[PDB]
Amino acid sequence: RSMGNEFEDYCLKRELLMGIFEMGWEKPSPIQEESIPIALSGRDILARAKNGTGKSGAYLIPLLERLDLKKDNIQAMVIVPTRELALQVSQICIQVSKHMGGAKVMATTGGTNLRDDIMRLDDTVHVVIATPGRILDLIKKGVAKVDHVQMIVLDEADKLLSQDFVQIMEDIILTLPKNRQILLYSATFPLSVQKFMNSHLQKPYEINLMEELTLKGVTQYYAYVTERQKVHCLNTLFSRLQINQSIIFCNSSQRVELLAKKISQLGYSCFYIHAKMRQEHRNRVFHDFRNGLCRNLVCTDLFTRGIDIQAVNVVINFDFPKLAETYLHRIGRSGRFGHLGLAINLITYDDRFNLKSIEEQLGTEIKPIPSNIDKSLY
């Protein structure tokens, strides 16, 4: 129930509004505009929302608003399935709450050291952001005392309630006070999530808060090029466009490598990511890229986080995909970081039927590359 189109209308603490302002969040997004006042009333929430940190704002804001900083007790918990997501969510939570004067936020996962987290919990922590196994362990050892937890967030509940974690999640909930507010966010709602809902959520407010992927806003081109001329065509593009950061998609892990090697030697600034890499390394590359240590990332369709990189304004399909859905995942955006400016498809003659099929299935338009870029291939 929207209280209005401005953060100021929600009667949040001034210190919290300042944190929101400094994030660059000028106006509440639609997911925030609905999620926030319901959460502030105390209702349980069951929300459909896409994977990742885009929606962290929607729950961190009422979470921080509800903290009593004069109490030295854990008061709120965010459960996430991976260590990476816990680091991201905690970083955001720390930045959002930096003006509140004393809000203690802590991330604890299999990635962080157990002994060290124990030591840390000797001091005041108000908000814990954790992976399920770790937080259940701390609760069971009496290190995380949770008898004052009045709010718990389950972020990506479908993954939290899969066979790997569903019993651990059950164990956690049962240690919390019975009246605790539960806010659940998930991309899908399989049987496991429905079961948890009926057992634990008290007459939840249910909202579909998913921003679908649109091609609106993105100018899409295609250029017919033989396999022999693709790199040369690529060189033209990087001599004619204004590229802040770009993502270059190839169709296999092998081709990503070979391409990255070739263009690295041509003076390009790039890193590459693909499937045959340990996740820790993938995470390291993504962090570096998001931090601007290189200008272009070469990758397969396994990299889904390009969405979380604001500076990416150009995507290149070095290899054209076979499926409309694959194309939409590569080029589509939700609009929260806005839309990409530009998508460019390098297509061989044999890609034409797919180009046409995909354009039509997506109800979009992919124009030929303009003349003054097409020249200079020659």
Binding site: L17, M18, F21, S239, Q242, S269, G341
Partner: protein, 236 residues
């Protein structure tokens, strides 16, 4: 788009046409700036010298300021480090003047027919300006940009003008904390701060502008309460 630079493009298409380098040079310049990183800067800078003649440098300053810096705030440190590495003090001056020029195009543009992006373009150029003047111990001369009067003129014009100008001024002044010459309690800096502190006392200034000023203070390690607001607005 959120990076529409038409307002800058149009204003340029009505200025003294300068010498455009050949396409192969233009392309080489775009490639360099597209692929510039901290780990190839030395190599890229050297490439830049070995390829661009002295007579094209005006074009390059126009390219860098209008087409890159105005919409790539995330790479401001990189281009600034690029200038330091280039060691071309006469190029730096062209970039400075191009920065002042585009800033004025924005400041004086009709705010009603403005693109959504123009506010961002202004903020970004202000951030850059602060980086190539104040942060490097060079003054912002009032004959180029009189910041204090800008604030006063904005306050006369109304909330819309304040919404453009105040975040511009804040982005500029952010760099002053990195300057031995211009860091507080430098008199030029504090006079601007004192005017901002006075705006901050206006009951009906939009909350987000009040936050711009308070966050500016925090960045300059200034106690907002320790500022000395005058009565410059009480005439208006």
């Amino acid at each position: 788009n959120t990076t529409n630079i038409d307002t800058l493009l149009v204003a340029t298409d009505q200025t003294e046409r300068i010498v455009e380098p050949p396409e192969n040079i233009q392309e080489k310049i775009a490639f360099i700036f597209n692929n510039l990183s901290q780990s190839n800067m030395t190599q890229k800078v050297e490439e830049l010298k070995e390829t661009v003649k002295e007579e094209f440098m005006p074009w390059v300053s126009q390219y860098l300021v209008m087409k890159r810096v105005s919409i790539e705030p995330n790479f401001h440190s990189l281009y600034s480090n690029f200038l330091d590495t280039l060691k071309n003090p006469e190029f730096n001056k062209m970039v400075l003047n191009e920065t002042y020029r585009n800033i004025k195009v924005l400041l004086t543009s009709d705010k009603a027919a403005a693109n959504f992006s123009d506010r961002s373009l202004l903020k970004n150029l202000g951030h850059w300006l602060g980086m190539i003047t104040l942060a490097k111990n060079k003054p912002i001369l009032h004959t180029d940009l009189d910041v204090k009067s800008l604030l006063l003129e904005a306050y006369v014009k109304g909330q819309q003008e304040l919404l453009y100008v105040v975040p511009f001024v804040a982005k500029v002044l952010e760099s002053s904390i990195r300057s031995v010459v211009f860091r507080p309690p430098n008199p030029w800096t504090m006079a601007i701060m004192n005017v901002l502190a006075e705006l901050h006392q206006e009951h009906d200034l939009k909350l987000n502008l009040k936050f711009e000023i308070e966050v500016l203070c925090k960045n300059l390690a200034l106690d907002i309460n320790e500022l000395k607001p005058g009565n410059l607005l009480k005439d208006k």
